[PDB]
Amino acid sequence: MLTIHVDQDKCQGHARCKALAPELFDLDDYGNAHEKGDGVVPADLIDKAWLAKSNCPENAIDITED
Ligand code: F3S
């Protein structure tokens, strides 16, 4: 059981998360990312989740595990 969170404070709109996991993130008009509706990570996107997290230069992405 995974969900994804973007910390707006840390986020500087690099947009790596979006490029890697389009299904998981949306950017606002100003370039910042935020989790898509559900937030829950589908089984086929679990690797892209950790990948986006690993890839954020600002360490702005959080993944919770239950
Ligand atoms: S800085 Fe922001 S746009 Fe994505 S890659 Fe990191 S959360």
Instruction: Decide: 15 in ligand 1 pocket, CB within 6 A.
Output: yes
15 is an annotated ligand-binding site residue: yes
Q: How many CA atoms lie within 13 A of 31 on its CB side?
A: 8
CATH architecture of 1-66: 2-Layer Sandwich (3.30)
Experimental method: X-ray
Q: Across the strands, what pairs with 34?
A: 26
- Return the best residue to mutate from 4, 14, 27, 59 for the ligand 1 pocket (most ligand atoms within 8 A of CB): 14
Q: How many CA atoms lie within 13 A of 39 on its CB side?
A: 11
Taking the domains of the chain in order of start, what are their residue ranges? 1-66
**Cβ-Cβ contacts under 8 Å for 52 (sequence gap 6 or more):** 4, 16, 17, 20, 21, 24, 25, 61
Q: How many CA atoms lie within 13 A of 35 on its CB side?
A: 19
Instruction: Decide: 34 in ligand 1 pocket, CB within 6 A.
Output: no
Resolution in Å, one decimal, please: 2.3
What distance in Å separates the CA atoms of residue 40 and residue 22, rounded to the nearest whole number? 14
